[PDB]
Design a binder for these strands. Sequence first.
DNA 1: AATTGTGAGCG
DNA 2: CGCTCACAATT
Length: 51
Amino acid sequence: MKPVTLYDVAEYAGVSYQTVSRVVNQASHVSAKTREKVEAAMAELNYIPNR
DNA sequence: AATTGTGAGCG
DNA sequence: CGCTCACAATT
Ligand code: NA
């Protein structure tokens, strides 16, 4: 399956791969609508942890 | 001060 | 190349 990285969800959502990382781990500085976009994205793309 | 991006450092 | 961790320079 399509190896959906953080970079991929991040690009689609409207955020940097760092921020989508700090949704998962080192979680900090993912603000209201940007985090809503990642919560959207997590479903709209089927993210693969580590690849 | 608030986050991104740079860097750094492990995977 | 993939992800986490903390930090400062831009803003
Ligand atoms: Na992860």
